[PDB]
Design a protein around this ligand. Structure first.
Ligand SMILES: [Zn+2]
Ligand SMILES: [Zn+2]
Lengths: 78, 80
């Protein structure tokens, strides 16, 4: 289901307004917002990531904690 | 110091500026910035404000105006 970006961006309701990394960028990087703080979790690899700061690459950090993540490696593409 | 009112002289200071920067040396120099020589920290030749941690999509003049809306450079003081 969450394979679709939108189903993912939806979960970003009440996302910390001042986050240096937009909900959109994360939804795009394949993350889901857990609801607490700025913690999000990859729907494909389940790897969770938080404490985002200026300069971060949503896709970049993603790959760092899960370089072999299915989504990162374009498994769900067209 | 030097005649930094000229873009070319400001650009000379970016000799060892880090290669992989999202914002280019010329874009920064064109915005009145001198390279301090450390990391990606640059400093306005006119208002002396320092700015760093450049990111993809940043506007050199934009951030510059952010920390010094009154910078003489940003305001045309040096115009011909
Ligand atoms: Zn993943
Ligand atoms: Zn200035």
């Amino acid at each position: 289901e969450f394979v679709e970006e939108f189903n993912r961006l939806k979960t970003f309701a009440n996302f910390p307004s001042g986050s240096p990394v937009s909900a959109s960028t994360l939804a795009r990087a394949g993350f889901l917002y857990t609801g607490e703080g700025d913690t999000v979790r990859c729907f494909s690899c389940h790897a969770a990531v938080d404490r985002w700061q200026y300069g971060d690459s949503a896709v970049g950090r993603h790959r760092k904690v899960s370089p072999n993540c299915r989504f990162i490696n374009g498994f769900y593409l067209e």
